[PDB]
């Protein structure tokens, strides 16, 4: 009912992976506070989680001024990447106000798609060295896939 109570529901649904219900709730918050940056960010996340990449990208691109330096560069680049706009995704990553681990993760994937395998390997070696998650075996698999792609050429 109240905005903080709506946020409580956003958090509960998101934590449980119910992005559909979180999105419905976030949209109610946006009806009350139309340019709430956190709500716009959550909406974009819900849309990506439900495979609505065009809609997510549209949210970002129609709120450019409001999202300045919370530009959602990771999410924007992610959507472009999933929409096979790889050059756009690269540009978005490179022009991001603040670099982050998630941006670097996506950057590795973008370089792989661009067949820039040497720089890709450097990015993945770095990610494996400095990781703080449970995805290192998956990253090592990515590393091996990159080397396999290179081997095709020699």
């Amino acid at each position: 009912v109240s905005v903080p109570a709506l946020w409580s529901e956003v958090n509960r649904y998101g934590q449980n992976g119910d992005f559909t219900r979180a999105l419905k709730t976030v949209n109610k918050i946006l009806q009350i506070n139309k340019d709430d940056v956190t709500a716009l960010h959550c909406k974009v996340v819900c849309l990506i989680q439900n495979g609505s990449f065009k809609e997510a990208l549209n949210v970002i691109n129609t709120h450019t001024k409001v999202l300045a330096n919370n530009s959602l560069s990771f999410e924007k680049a992610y959507c472009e990447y999933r929409l096979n706009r790889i050059e756009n995704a690269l540009k978005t990553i490179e022009s991001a106000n603040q670099q982050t681990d998630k941006l670097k993760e996506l950057y590795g994937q973008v370089l792989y798609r661009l067949e820039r395998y040497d720089e890709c390997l450097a990015v993945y070696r770095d990610l494996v060295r400095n990781s703080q998650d449970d995805y290192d075996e998956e990253r090592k698999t990515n590393l091996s896939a990159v080397v396999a792609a290179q081997s095709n050429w020699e």
């Binding site: 946020w7 956003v10 956190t38 960010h41 990447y81 993760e105 994937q109 792989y112 896939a145």
Partner: peptide
């Protein structure tokens, strides 16, 4: 042989405690 989209795993809400608190 496999290549994983690990970036998808990082698609997550920002911290919400300020919004929960009505800060």
């Amino acid at each position: 042989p496999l290549f994983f989209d690990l970036a998808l795993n990082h698609v997550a809400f920002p911290p919400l405690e300020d919004k929960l608190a009505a800060a």
